[PDB]
Design a protein around this ligand. Structure first.
Ligand SMILES: *[C@@H]1O[C@H](CO)[C@@H](O[C@@H]2O[C@H](CO)[C@@H](O[C@@H]3O[C@H](CO[C@H]4O[C@H](CO)[C@@H](O)[C@H](O)[C@@H]4O)[C@@H](O)[C@H](O[C@H]4O[C@H](CO)[C@@H](O)[C@H](O)[C@@H]4O)[C@@H]3O)[C@H](O)[C@H]2NC(C)=O)[C@H](O)[C@H]1NC(C)=O
Ligand SMILES: *[C@@H]1O[C@H](CO[C@@H]2O[C@@H](C)[C@@H](O)[C@@H](O)[C@@H]2O)[C@@H](O[C@@H]2O[C@H](CO)[C@@H](O[C@@H]3O[C@H](CO)[C@@H](O)[C@H](O[C@H]4O[C@H](CO)[C@@H](O)[C@H](O)[C@@H]4O)[C@@H]3O)[C@H](O)[C@H]2NC(C)=O)[C@H](O)[C@H]1NC(C)=O
Ligand SMILES: *[C@@H]1O[C@H](CO)[C@@H](O[C@@H]2O[C@H](CO)[C@@H](O[C@@H]3O[C@H](CO)[C@@H](O)[C@H](O[C@H]4O[C@H](CO)[C@@H](O)[C@H](O)[C@@H]4O)[C@@H]3O)[C@H](O)[C@H]2NC(C)=O)[C@H](O)[C@H]1NC(C)=O
Ligand SMILES: *[C@@H]1O[C@H](CO)[C@@H](O[C@@H]2O[C@H](CO)[C@@H](O[C@@H]3O[C@H](CO)[C@@H](O)[C@H](O[C@H]4O[C@H](CO)[C@@H](O)[C@H](O)[C@@H]4O)[C@@H]3O)[C@H](O)[C@H]2NC(C)=O)[C@H](O)[C@H]1NC(C)=O
Ligand SMILES: *[C@@H]1O[C@H](CO)[C@@H](O[C@@H]2O[C@H](CO)[C@@H](O)[C@H](O)[C@H]2NC(C)=O)[C@H](O)[C@H]1NC(C)=O
Ligand SMILES: *[C@@H]1O[C@H](CO)[C@@H](O)[C@H](O)[C@H]1NC(C)=O
Lengths: 395, 75, 396
């Protein structure tokens, strides 16, 4: 979308994978969906360096609404779970230096059953603008025709523009049309800031595998569409949760850095391991994600349960990720000629290679005819940064 | 329900060995495209030349009981 | 098998999941299938307290043999990867106070193309017994018929009885019998110490899911067969590897304690996390698995992505595992009436409940009409031990 926003991929926090639709504040007050949760999250986003690392958008997913609209036809928050209102929450998030997001749907209803924005596009866009909301995650549940889907997404895209407020417009437009339509992503880039491609992520290595395989299969149609202002959204980061190994978390962080992905956390910042915090606040990996050139990486090759991905970086640099997809055994050795990396120009005539994940170490200079050998853990990813001749005469 | 679980464990196990019978399975379903009659046979062969390497990968991540539940044999 | 062995489930160490068939010892000498690996594994099984927990059987899986037999028709190891021989390696294992295991096959070849033992059952049986072998894993790769499979397994059992040495005989009989015929588990219990039922494990949560689902499906066939002497082998333990989370490792340890399963580790003892060491050496969980009553646990309840398993223990004690199979969200609460546990007699009229996994804490006394409430992490398991009115001065 040509709104001057999402020039780098959007970084922040979303509550759906960790907290879901928890409406029981009587028995579980610390985990139900309330403004207390988001205010504690906004405190920890500054107090733990999440704001310093680049995460800024404290977004809200489903199950924030009252079951009915008000007498004026506007959306209203739940009186028990959000008594002080969305606008006061937005002011508290802006007072902490962060930005606040919110959720809505093109359909009659949202995905949980809360009221959607069909027939109320201008009204709800103005409501989120008056509340001070800086990001919209606009879902596509309970939509009856794809014409209604496309017209609702375009109507909200123009209606948020008519508010005059800078907003981030996250779409689920190609999410609910892939079983029966090939999406024309030029339209989706024209009307959205980033778009959800494949199905919803969960706390499993299965979802990481399926999302990466679907992205690598359709990479001829979605890579060149991605740029500053429009990104491919492979849902949320699930690092810091219950159902991923450490190598699988490293795989998700490295491949989200390669795919120019919007790094939306879904964890509990009150209860997070220091290792997941150090992985999610890695400077040299977020720098790959927030590369100012903003060109999405792609799968270079696959075979022998090995995947090699590369992303062009700004300033004659490249980012190379290698995945061992073999889920049996130990650290497997992989050797690749660096003349095949970066269309033959990434190491012409010499490139310095610095491994960033799973550990930060330097691997010395490699000439054009040289071969790079590394060891990759199963269900793990070795991510590396490659320089070129554009370096000082000091080494 | 359970017979599907046995058959899908068999199909998942046979490529867990990395035998590359993916080509044999794609050739088998391309042969099954001739069951549709001469009109839709080459339509099925075009739709099975693409979207078949990726779909078995989604089925390889998927649990066999989940495959039977999603196609309607169990839930 | 009335050999006097495997009265408790067998504890030890196999190599197939972590090291597989690495034969390139020039490029990777530290991680190839050589006697240096097993010597270092025995040294760390003594030095790191793995023996003191209960793991003793340092076993060898496939890819140890020479590509051809010798001039006497006997099996022989690889002369480069095993320069000193199997007998000297077994002496090194016995010098540390451990026991050594080895692998063979009923077919013409093993699963890696190495020579099998079809028509060589007695010869290789006396060869292993003279080398000092205390455990045999017998596979079923490259076997032509079910009659040949059954007769070869019976022949190997009778030959290992004829040697006279105390050898724990592990079989892959119902693993290869199930795709064509319903296995007769009384006969398998008659001839084997423990038998592999489902396919080979890998470093994934999906394999744990499929093994547990298959065990819960066929629990009316294989639970009452299991006792002292005869166990059901799911597969090797994979705790300490690259592909499981902490809660999935907790799930595997608690459920292998519930299922009266053999605890064969398959990891790197040179590189293991302290959390995996503390989980694999949990005294109360191993005491649940090594319970002298020998009755295999069973799935009590399944619903709403929740799984309740229970195992009867000695002294009227019970072990209860609760699994949250929902792989999205945070921890989920679960409340169950304790009168539904242990066929109604586990907490009659009262019971003390002690949580053991994922953390050890005392939950206090619960009556017969009481309801137990708990919270389970996603892909995780809460493991509990319950004692009835068979306790004194611990009741105050
Ligand atoms: C080759 O195969 C044969 C055939 O099975 C094996 O022979 C068996 O060996 C076991 C050895 O453990 C024998 O079992 C033991 O019997 C002892 C008493 O003998 C008699 O006792 C009563 C009648 O008085 C009968 O019920 C019994 O069958 C015998 O007639 C018991 O005291 C032993 O119990 C002790 O060990 C067990 C572990 O097995 C513990 O659980 C107990 O708590 C206790 O400590 C034991 O039960 C069995 O009788 C033999 N059977 C036959 C037919 O000979 C060979 O051992 C085997 N050889 C090799 C090398 O594998
Ligand atoms: C939000 O919901 C409204 C309607 O509300 C819900 O639907 C009703 C069925 C009923 O259950 C209500 O109680 C409930 O709240 C949706 O609006 C409907 O949109 C469809 C679009 O397909 C309209 O159907 C069309 O109506 C035309 C005349 O009004 C008629 O000419 C059309 O017929 C042609 O097309 C059909 C193909 O479906 C074909 O079969 C015919 O032969 C012919 O070619 C067609 O019937 C409904 O009339 C609309 N309902 C109302 C009350 O206006 C709305 O789409 C939905 N929004 C989203 C995003 O899902
Ligand atoms: C509603 O939609 C309209 C589109 O029809 C949109 O108007 C666009 O606004 C952006 C403002 O961000 C304009 O982009 C600028 O164009 C000028 C040239 O005219 C450039 O100088 C600007 O470049 C600077 O800023 C960039 C960051 O955005 C930097 O990357 C750059 O290096 C410079 O520092 C900038 O590109 C754009 O031209 C218009 N488009 C049109 C057709 O007028 C409007 O903003 C939308 N309104 C809302 C509320 O969303
Ligand atoms: C290891 O490899 C050896 C060598 O291949 C193998 O031994 C062979 O087993 C086959 C079993 O099919 C034997 O073939 C049989 O021979 C007898 C005569 O000796 C025939 O009567 C049999 O014919 C009947 O069965 C056929 C089906 O197989 C029918 O088609 C036919 O009409 C008859 O009903 C049968 O041909 C063969 O003789 C041996 N060879 C030797 C040298 O022993 C052994 O089985 C392999 N072991 C394992 C574990 O796989
Ligand atoms: C996606 O669809 C749109 C149509 O909605 C295509 O845009 C059209 O491009 C032609 C260029 O020849 C223009 O004349 C039309 O005016 C455009 N339509 C609109 C509504 O503006 C677009 O080309 C399609 N994307 C791709 C990649 O083909
Ligand atoms: C299983 O084997 C035992 C002894 O070998 C025998 O008594 C029993 O009848 C067999 N079961 C069946 C179903 O034949």
């Amino acid at each position: 979308l040509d709104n001057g926003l999402a020039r780098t991929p959007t970084m922040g926090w979303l509550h759906w994978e960790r907290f879901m639709c928890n409406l029981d504040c009587q028995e579980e007050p610390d985990s139900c969906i309330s403004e207390k949760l988001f205010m504690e999250m906004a405190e920890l986003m500054v107090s733990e360096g999440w704001k310093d690392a680049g995460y800024e958008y404290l977004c809200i997913d489903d199950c924030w609404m009252a079951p009915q609209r008000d007498s004026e036809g506007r959306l209203q928050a739940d009186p028990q779970r959000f008594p002080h209102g969305i606008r006061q929450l937005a002011n508290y998030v802006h007072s902490k230096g962060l930005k606040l997001g919110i959720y809505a749907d093109v359909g009659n209803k949202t995905c949980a059953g809360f009221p959607g924005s069909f027939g109320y596009y201008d009204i709800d866009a103005q409501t989120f603008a008056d509340w001070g909301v800086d990001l919209l995650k606009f879902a596509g549940c309970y939509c009856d025709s794809l014409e209604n889907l496309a017209d609702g997404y375009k109507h909200m895209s123009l209606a948020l523009n008519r508010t005059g407020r800078s907003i981030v417009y996250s779409c689920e437009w190609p999410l609910y049309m892939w079983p029966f339509q090939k999406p024309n992503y030029t339209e989706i880039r024209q009307y959205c800031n980033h778009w959800r491609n494949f199905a919803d992520i969960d706390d499993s290595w299965k979802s990481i595998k399926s999302i990466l395989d679907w992205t690598s299969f359709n990479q001829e149609r979605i890579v060149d569409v991605a740029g500053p202002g429009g990104w491919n959204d492979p849902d949320m980061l699930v690092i810091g949760n219950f159902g991923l190994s450490w190598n699988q978390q490293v795989t998700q962080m490295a491949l989200w850095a390669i795919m120019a992905a919007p790094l939306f956390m879904s964890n509990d910042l009150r209860h997070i391991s220091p290792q997941a915090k150090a992985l999610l606040q890695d400077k040299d990996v977020i720098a790959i994600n927030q590369d100012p050139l903003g060109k999405q990486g792609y799968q270079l090759r696959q075979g022998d349960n090995f995947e090699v991905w590369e992303r062009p970086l700004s300033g004659l640099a490249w980012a190379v990720a290698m995945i061992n997809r073999q889920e049996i055994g130990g650290p497997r050795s992989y050797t690749i000629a660096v003349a095949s990396l970066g269309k033959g120009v990434a190491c012409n005539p010499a490139c310095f290679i610095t491994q960033l994940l799973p550990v930060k170490r330097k691997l010395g200079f490699y000439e054009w005819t040289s071969r790079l050998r590394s060891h990759i853990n199963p269900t793990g990813t070795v991510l590396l940064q490659l320089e070129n001749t554009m370096q000082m005469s000091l080494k | 329900c359970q017979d599907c679980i046995q058959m899908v464990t068999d199909i998942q196990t046979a490529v867990r060995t990395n035998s590359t019978f993916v080509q044999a399975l794609v050739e088998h379903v391309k042969e099954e495209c001739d069951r549709l009659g001469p009109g839709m046979a080459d339509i099925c062969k075009n739709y099975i030349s693409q979207y078949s390497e990726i779909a078995i990968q989604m089925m390889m991540h998927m649990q066999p009981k989940e495959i039977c539940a999603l196609v309607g044999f169990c839930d």
